[PDB]
Design a binder for this molecule. Sequence first.
Ligand SMILES: CCC1=C(C)/C(=C/C2=NC(=C\c3[nH]c(/C=C4/NC(=O)[C@H](C)[C@H]4CC)c(C)c3CCC(=O)O)/C(CCC(=O)O)=C2C)NC1=O
Ligand SMILES: CCC1=C(C)/C(=C/C2=NC(=C\c3[nH]c(/C=C4\NC(=O)[C@H](C)[C@H]4CC)c(C)c3CCC(=O)O)/C(CCC(=O)O)=C2C)NC1=O
Ligand SMILES: CCC1=C(C)/C(=C/C2=NC(=C\c3[nH]c(/C=C4\NC(=O)[C@H](C)[C@H]4CC)c(C)c3CCC(=O)O)/C(CCC(=O)O)=C2C)NC1=O
Ligand SMILES: CCC1=C(C)/C(=C/C2=NC(=C\c3[nH]c(/C=C4\NC(=O)[C@H](C)[C@H]4CC)c(C)c3CCC(=O)O)/C(CCC(=O)O)=C2C)NC1=O
Ligand SMILES: CCC1=C(C)/C(=C/C2=NC(=C\c3[nH]c(/C=C4\NC(=O)[C@H](C)[C@H]4CC)c(C)c3CCC(=O)O)/C(CCC(=O)O)=C2C)NC1=O
Ligand SMILES: CCC1=C(C)/C(=C/C2=NC(=C\c3[nH]c(/C=C4\NC(=O)[C@H](C)[C@H]4CC)c(C)c3CCC(=O)O)/C(CCC(=O)O)=C2C)NC1=O
Ligand SMILES: CCC1=C(C)/C(=C/C2=NC(=C\c3[nH]c(/C=C4\NC(=O)[C@H](C)[C@H]4CC)c(C)c3CCC(=O)O)/C(CCC(=O)O)=C2C)NC1=O
Ligand SMILES: CCC1=C(C)/C(=C/C2=NC(=C\c3[nH]c(/C=C4\NC(=O)[C@H](C)[C@H]4CC)c(C)c3CCC(=O)O)/C(CCC(=O)O)=C2C)NC1=O
Ligand SMILES: CCC1=C(C)/C(=C/C2=NC(=C\c3[nH]c(/C=C4\NC(=O)[C@H](C)[C@H]4CC)c(C)c3CCC(=O)O)/C(CCC(=O)O)=C2C)NC1=O
Ligand SMILES: CCC1=C(C)/C(=C/C2=NC(=C\c3[nH]c(/C=C4\NC(=O)[C@H](C)[C@H]4CC)c(C)c3CCC(=O)O)/C(CCC(=O)O)=C2C)NC1=O
Ligand SMILES: CCC1=C(C)/C(=C/C2=NC(=C\c3[nH]c(/C=C4\NC(=O)[C@H](C)[C@H]4CC)c(C)c3CCC(=O)O)/C(CCC(=O)O)=C2C)NC1=O
Lengths: 172, 172, 172, 206, 69, 162, 163, 162, 162
Amino acid sequence: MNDVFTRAIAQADLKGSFLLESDLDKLASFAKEGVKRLDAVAALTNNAPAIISDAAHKLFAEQQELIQPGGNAYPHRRMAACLRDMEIILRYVSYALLAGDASVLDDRCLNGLRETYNALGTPTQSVARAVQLMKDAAMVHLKSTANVTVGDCSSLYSEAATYFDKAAASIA
Amino acid sequence: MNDVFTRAIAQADLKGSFLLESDLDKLASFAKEGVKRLDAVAALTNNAPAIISDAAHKLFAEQQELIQPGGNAYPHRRMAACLRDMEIILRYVSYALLAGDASVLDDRCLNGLRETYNALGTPTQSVARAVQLMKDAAMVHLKSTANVTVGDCSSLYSEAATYFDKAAASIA
Amino acid sequence: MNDVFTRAIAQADLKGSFLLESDLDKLASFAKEGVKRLDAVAALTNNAPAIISDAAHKLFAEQQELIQPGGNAYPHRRMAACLRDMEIILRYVSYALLAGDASVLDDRCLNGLRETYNALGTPTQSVARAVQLMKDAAMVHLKSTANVTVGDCSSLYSEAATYFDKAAASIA
Amino acid sequence: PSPLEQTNTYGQERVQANAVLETPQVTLRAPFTEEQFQGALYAIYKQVFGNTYVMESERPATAESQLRDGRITVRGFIRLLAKSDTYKARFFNPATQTRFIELNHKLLLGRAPYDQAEISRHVALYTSQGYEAEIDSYLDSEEYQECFGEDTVPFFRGFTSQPGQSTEAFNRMVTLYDGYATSDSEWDRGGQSARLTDSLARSTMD
Amino acid sequence: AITTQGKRIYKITVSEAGAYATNKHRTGYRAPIRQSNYTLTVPYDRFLPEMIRLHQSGAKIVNVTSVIS
Amino acid sequence: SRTVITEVIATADSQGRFLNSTELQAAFGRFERAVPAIEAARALTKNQDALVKGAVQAVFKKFPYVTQPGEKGYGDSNQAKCARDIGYYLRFITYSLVASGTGPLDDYVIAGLREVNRAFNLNPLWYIEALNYIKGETGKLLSGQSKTEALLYIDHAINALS
Amino acid sequence: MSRTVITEVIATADSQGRFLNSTELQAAFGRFERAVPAIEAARALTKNQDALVKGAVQAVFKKFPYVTQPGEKGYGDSNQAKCARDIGYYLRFITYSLVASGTGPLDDYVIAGLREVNRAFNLNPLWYIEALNYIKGETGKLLSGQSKTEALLYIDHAINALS
Amino acid sequence: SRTVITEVIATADSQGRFLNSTELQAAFGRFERAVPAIEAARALTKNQDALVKGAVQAVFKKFPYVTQPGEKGYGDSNQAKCARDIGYYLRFITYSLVASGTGPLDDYVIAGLREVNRAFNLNPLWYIEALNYIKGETGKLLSGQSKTEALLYIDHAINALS
Amino acid sequence: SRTVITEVIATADSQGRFLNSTELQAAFGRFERAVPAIEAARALTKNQDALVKGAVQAVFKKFPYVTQPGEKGYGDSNQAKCARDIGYYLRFITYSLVASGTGPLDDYVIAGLREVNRAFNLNPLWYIEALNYIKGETGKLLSGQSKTEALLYIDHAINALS
Ligand SMILES: CCC1=C(C)/C(=C/C2=NC(=C\c3[nH]c(/C=C4/NC(=O)[C@H](C)[C@H]4CC)c(C)c3CCC(=O)O)/C(CCC(=O)O)=C2C)NC1=O
Ligand SMILES: CCC1=C(C)/C(=C/C2=NC(=C\c3[nH]c(/C=C4\NC(=O)[C@H](C)[C@H]4CC)c(C)c3CCC(=O)O)/C(CCC(=O)O)=C2C)NC1=O
Ligand SMILES: CCC1=C(C)/C(=C/C2=NC(=C\c3[nH]c(/C=C4\NC(=O)[C@H](C)[C@H]4CC)c(C)c3CCC(=O)O)/C(CCC(=O)O)=C2C)NC1=O
Ligand SMILES: CCC1=C(C)/C(=C/C2=NC(=C\c3[nH]c(/C=C4\NC(=O)[C@H](C)[C@H]4CC)c(C)c3CCC(=O)O)/C(CCC(=O)O)=C2C)NC1=O
Ligand SMILES: CCC1=C(C)/C(=C/C2=NC(=C\c3[nH]c(/C=C4\NC(=O)[C@H](C)[C@H]4CC)c(C)c3CCC(=O)O)/C(CCC(=O)O)=C2C)NC1=O
Ligand SMILES: CCC1=C(C)/C(=C/C2=NC(=C\c3[nH]c(/C=C4\NC(=O)[C@H](C)[C@H]4CC)c(C)c3CCC(=O)O)/C(CCC(=O)O)=C2C)NC1=O
Ligand SMILES: CCC1=C(C)/C(=C/C2=NC(=C\c3[nH]c(/C=C4\NC(=O)[C@H](C)[C@H]4CC)c(C)c3CCC(=O)O)/C(CCC(=O)O)=C2C)NC1=O
Ligand SMILES: CCC1=C(C)/C(=C/C2=NC(=C\c3[nH]c(/C=C4\NC(=O)[C@H](C)[C@H]4CC)c(C)c3CCC(=O)O)/C(CCC(=O)O)=C2C)NC1=O
Ligand SMILES: CCC1=C(C)/C(=C/C2=NC(=C\c3[nH]c(/C=C4\NC(=O)[C@H](C)[C@H]4CC)c(C)c3CCC(=O)O)/C(CCC(=O)O)=C2C)NC1=O
Ligand SMILES: CCC1=C(C)/C(=C/C2=NC(=C\c3[nH]c(/C=C4\NC(=O)[C@H](C)[C@H]4CC)c(C)c3CCC(=O)O)/C(CCC(=O)O)=C2C)NC1=O
Ligand SMILES: CCC1=C(C)/C(=C/C2=NC(=C\c3[nH]c(/C=C4\NC(=O)[C@H](C)[C@H]4CC)c(C)c3CCC(=O)O)/C(CCC(=O)O)=C2C)NC1=O
């Protein structure tokens, strides 16, 4: 389970050379962006109830067969599992965001989810669509400037979007 | 774990509709005759040591390749496993009878026992023959009406016979 | 586990007969040579750390592409794992020698290690030269009669040879 | 450098389970705060029930409150949790007793069983003294205690050589883990069939 | 357990005598060193195995009191 | 789900022992208690739409501000969802009555209730009010054995809500 | 999976994550030195198994003759054949454990599950107790010295398992 | 691997919450100290070769008796190996600086050093005086908080070797 | 309660080992963040009364249907207890700022919050909105860092309320 720094260390060790000065500069730039990254992670943490709820209402507006009798999340426990998997996906993406790279998900969170949802009979595309709706809600919250030092987190918005979309692809 | 009544509720929720009138009338008829099934399983349980003793006695009467060295039940441990195997088979079928459903029997005994015996080298037809001796002794002790009021229990005998039938089919 | 005497008794049960006089003859021969067996196993135990050390020396001199970076022994935790591996495999083959029956080797040592190493990325061929260097180092101490009465153990010597041959063909 | 690259944890991620070798055990020793009360509880819950989600209404408030006071060790709370009906409903209820014992090994010792002789002995114990006796055997087994302790949360010690452990346990729990996502409910049909029995069959003979 | 015998839990007060400490040191401190004196709650059902395992651990019982009667 | 026979089976299986007199007595008791429970099931079956509409309008009486725009009760589709939820509750109560226990009810609503309540801000007091109205009106629809047992199912669900 | 001296030695040494110390090597030597009298006992008991089994049959008949009465489970030609086969199995396994110099063969082969056999088949151990008592009475002259007490130990272990 | 961000991320994952003030505050501290530590590691890379070769010579000036023909220290490939190993030690120290966590040392060299030394009879004290040499130079070649943290990491490296 | 150094010492005693870098850096983090939290505590010390009052009026305002007679909002003792509650919460918030951690706030209000919330009909969202008001004035009273961590602590209080 690697961050940008730890991974960089890993491949630098793989070539068996010292860290390259340019790599040092990239890590320094990451250090510069660290405060923005912490703002982003804190914002993601703060708006967790609102984001999970809003994603739920979009999902349920656009799909109803999930809640139909026998629908893949029909009972209260099963609907709760439906929502809590999407929130745990948010959990792990936030984890990667603070960690600064997308290794942690493919390491542990989405290591074997495909076969799990096939075995559960879960339609993958539904989980994917939930992921993009989570993405929409998340970007909506992150573009907010509430009580934050103004700047340019466009890199962070794009990179969290990469998290979301690659996780959604891995769901498939 | 599911019984025929529980499976009826299951289909009721699968269509999402309330319990019907005809099927609930059938359930009431089952409830009034539940005493019959209770008496049948009571006869099974009281005569269970006798039933297993007689079935095993005729089992070793017909088959002799087991008591000989290299037989599937030669050492005390192996035929002990055999004996408790028939014991467990009859016990789980009695559970199925109380449920009226083989789903408990399937979930307990038949989820993975056949490949278990394949790995062990145990032949299945021997176990099926043991099951049929089980049914012979069981119907002998149950179709007797000693110390109990007499009545029509052909449905109960048929249900127990069919449950041993599906058990034998699953194992072999 | 199943020692040589245990294997004799097991095959006797498989044929369901008493021991032959010739059986007791081989078993008495094994019992009388057990003293030389104990001398051999003591030779193993006394030099075991030394043996694993110099065997590793010949291995890594023979194969330099591993201690260097990018090798599955580089990060020096893999030093610990590798050394423990030689230690434990020599320990189990010592167990096999003492018992005189390679069964315990097969069970406790090499039931499924091939998949273990392949799923770990370890090239087992290296392990095969590892164990043959192990025998090369050990046989010197075995021939060492320092502080022990001299004698012929060509039977024991060949037995250990075939033991490590089993280990080689196994892990290969 | 080598023609082929081998990173530090490379074995950890090529095997389906990496973080378990990195994620530590948890202990609850001295009076402490609600935050990691619930943290340790969630860890234990994901641990013991094979990555099945432990639904909130299922938990006994009295047992966790008593553990909060500490009249019991964590081991006693594990025992009481094993006595919970929902535990049997998840594992004892839909699965065969051999598959039951394999799952119980995985979830109470973190490792697959060593040999089919262990399987036979443990089934014999279950047959002789009912359900809870086998669980009490695991939680009273000495290697569990000395390896974990009265106050340590059980974890997956698989993918890690245990003192005098069979070479088969690694392979079996590799086949049995298959990631975080693998739940052992009555669904997914994997917690019902005894995946290990075929491998265990080879152990008795040679 | 539910039986009249199964109830009547008995409190057990345990001291890590020198024998237990010597045993634990040589077996290895795979668990944190906890203080010598500690009370433990043990029902009738598992009453025997408690001081059995403590005796194989080398520890000795301080005293035992009965919760019920 | 969990019906008296199912706990009997599972418990007997636990200790690895056959059935005994006590569990057969419990099964017997279930068998005679089923008939009043079946009658209660019929009574709640033929009154379903009135049950739903009365509960929704009682919620209106105690919680009319909920129907105000910008809140949950506002919206025709929202109210269709309210009625559908209450109908699901009553159907599971019927399953509970026919089950001689709370097995299916627990399994299909009580497993995961407060979680969704927090999720969509679904106040359990709303459903407490709805089931209190159902209790009051079943005070008229039913009588005697069926009334009392259906009341115990409904107020068990209520206490689970609380 | 039979328990013997060397096998339990290997298991214990594997258990502690250690090699074989002085104690296990000395125990192995003791096993080698004690095997030869066990070998003599096994061979001598192998020679004269016919007389032992027939005398055991008549002795168990003499102890409780009522089992041989008609209408009892002991009466019958098949019953006699089974008695002879069973006692032959006992002496087979006792010689086996003498050879292994450990009760483990007997343990696994008979002592595993014997009790449920006796309860499910009403075969009270008393008849097999008498059989083993006759075996010890006859072997009190068949063997000598160490082999005598060696055989006595394992047959009495079988008795204690039966009792 | 192991580094303050990674312990935080694990103890928030395996514990199952969202992060609060303490851990993000630690992240603030790490992301701010990066520049001192990172330029320090840059300097270490900038002066590494003198460090390693003078470390070899320092060992010999303290351990000449290990060098004579007929004992372990004698040997040309032996020498190349000596420089190689101390090179990795310096290297992993640099990685530790970059990660701002004692992790890389733990994962690679502190993981299982003791028994491989016992296998090869490698006296850790050798590496200890090599690192003492290293700290003697870094006292001058580096300044302020950077020399502080570098000294701290190499001290913990000795404590491992100790 | 616990401060950051409390987890520091608890962990270090848990492994029974001496403190390495990371927890000492946490000690820093706390020390340099102390001052901003210090003026945050200063401000909250000066402003408390109006904060409590405005919380009372705001919760009466955006929840109008609780104010009228016949429910929780009506009854003088009710809003007296509201005022004492808000005073206690923001005092624990000051404690959180001083401790630079959730310790006092958590172990004083957060423990057992939900079961009390439905054990006395006290709607939590009442308290979420009270703390939202408190955010309302603190968005003007404080500035910079003090504002930032005060915001975070009141956010965590809300999050545990939510
Ligand atoms: C592990 C090797 C092995 C042993 C040890 C063995 C003993 C043995 N003999 C049996 C039958 C029997 N054995 C006897 C002999 C009895 N008659 C009396 O005098 C005495 C109590 C005793 C002999 C002294 C009899 C009469 C039966 C018939 C029981 C029946 O089938 O009803 C059975 C029950 C299985 C069956 O009835 O077919 C066993 C286990 N069989 C084996 O394969
Ligand atoms: C209690 C924990 C804590 C947090 C979270 C925190 C945030 C924080 N973010 C900062 C800078 C910043 N913060 C942001 C992020 C914002 N700007 C835009 O991008 C977005 C609207 C928004 C993203 C959420 C940016 C972009 C900077 C300046 C850095 C840069 O532009 O590269 C600063 C420095 C203020 C300055 O010197 O001007 C702080 C203190 N401080 C803390 O003590
Ligand atoms: C605690 C367990 C339990 C037992 C043992 C029990 C015996 C029992 N079975 C009954 C019903 C009965 N059960 C049977 C079935 C029996 N008769 C048939 O011939 C078969 C041989 C056999 C079943 C295989 C019959 C015929 C009745 C009476 C008819 C009826 O159900 O009304 C009744 C009610 C008789 C009455 O109300 O007048 C009793 C007391 N009841 C129990 O609650
Ligand atoms: C603690 C367990 C134990 C051990 C270790 C043991 C060793 C041992 N080996 C002996 C004889 C012997 N030992 C050996 C074996 C050695 N000579 C061969 O050259 C080989 C190089 C080597 C074996 C690999 C031989 C050949 C004899 C002579 C006995 C004979 O004539 O067969 C003796 C009797 C005389 C003496 O004291 O040396 C002992 C005690 N005895 C024990 O009770
Ligand atoms: C029961 C006895 C037993 C055996 C047989 C055994 C083999 C074994 N070696 C392993 C890892 C390993 N094994 C090795 C050694 C190999 N790699 C290099 O190529 C060397 C040349 C070569 C040594 C011959 C290494 C370096 C690892 C570390 C791989 C990793 O951690 O990912 C593992 C996985 C986890 C572990 O135990 O460390 C097993 C199970 N383990 C046991 O407990
Ligand atoms: C460690 C990381 C992690 C993963 C990978 C994970 C997946 C996961 N999903 C599960 C069940 C579930 N998961 C879902 C969610 C999906 N199905 C529906 O189609 C929804 C549309 C969709 C949501 C987007 C549902 C509905 C269930 C309940 C199915 C059942 O078991 O009956 C379970 C069973 C847990 C238990 O109940 O004990 C797991 C482990 N959970 C985790 O904690
Ligand atoms: C076996 C099941 C079980 C029982 C029986 C149980 C009772 C129980 N109450 C306790 C203390 C306590 N008891 C009380 C209640 C009293 N103090 C005042 O508030 C009230 C006037 C009064 C209640 C009417 C309090 C407040 C504490 C702990 C003090 C604290 O929280 O610091 C404790 C010790 C520490 C604790 O867990 O709180 C136990 C074990 N807990 C259990 O898990
Ligand atoms: C709940 C579902 C379930 C059941 C009931 C079950 C029975 C079962 N049979 C087993 C093996 C066995 N089963 C038998 C019985 C067979 N051999 C005899 O000769 C007969 C021909 C035949 C029985 C009629 C034997 C002898 C073994 C021992 C394996 C062996 O020695 O090869 C074992 C493992 C060994 C042990 O229990 O000690 C189980 C658990 N397994 C399950 O998962
Ligand atoms: C297992 C069968 C099942 C049940 C029981 C169930 C309850 C349920 N009702 C819901 C929506 C709803 N539920 C209500 C009803 C409440 N809100 C207030 O206005 C009323 C006072 C009160 C009615 C008494 C409303 C208005 C909605 C729509 C808005 C929302 O909560 O998302 C939702 C969220 C998803 C959706 O339906 O769009 C669930 C899970 N869902 C199920 O699949
Ligand atoms: C498991 C299902 C079940 C329930 C729920 C149950 C309650 C119950 N108790 C009864 C007898 C009764 N129960 C009570 C007790 C009540 N009345 C008093 O005023 C108190 C308010 C209260 C006691 C504190 C009384 C007074 C009677 C009638 C007289 C008698 O006890 O014989 C009756 C017979 C009346 C009828 O059938 O309508 C029922 C149904 N019985 C059951 O088999
Ligand atoms: C990155 C982590 C890492 C570690 C910990 C490490 C230790 C290490 N030291 C080795 C050799 C060695 N290293 C030393 C110690 C050095 N030479 C002595 O002269 C000096 C006192 C001292 C330097 C100051 C020695 C004596 C050997 C044995 C050389 C041999 O016998 O072949 C070897 C390989 C065996 C060989 O091919 O010679 C390793 C793996 N290697 C690593 O890559």
